[PDB]
């Protein structure tokens, strides 16, 4: 018997198929997070600015209180 190269089929590798698929973000869903992060962003930032006003008047008060300076 003579032995040569043998053939293999099984699944035939599956040639030409789109492996690319959309993931995580769809379109409308990411905009709700996007503007949602903005709405949370400005609201939390301005609370510290109002807290800065408590310091702002009190810091400049030191110059008014000190006249022997």
């Amino acid at each position: 018997x003579x032995x040569x190269x043998x053939x293999x089929x099984x699944x035939x590798x599956x040639x030409x198929x789109x492996x690319x698929x959309x993931x995580x973000x769809x379109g409308y869903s990411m905009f709700a997070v996007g503007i949602g992060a903005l709405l949370f962003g400005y609201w939390s930032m301005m609370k510290w600015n109002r807290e800065r006003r408590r310091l702002q008047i009190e810091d400049f008060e030191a110059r008014i209180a000190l006249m022997p300076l």
Binding site: X12, X13, X16
Partner: peptide, 17 residues
């Protein structure tokens, strides 16, 4: 390149010894 493996796979299946 995506439509090249089809030729290779058909060459693997069809081989006369």
């Amino acid at each position: 390149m995506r439509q090249s493996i089809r030729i290779i796979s058909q060459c693997l299946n069809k081989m006369p010894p």
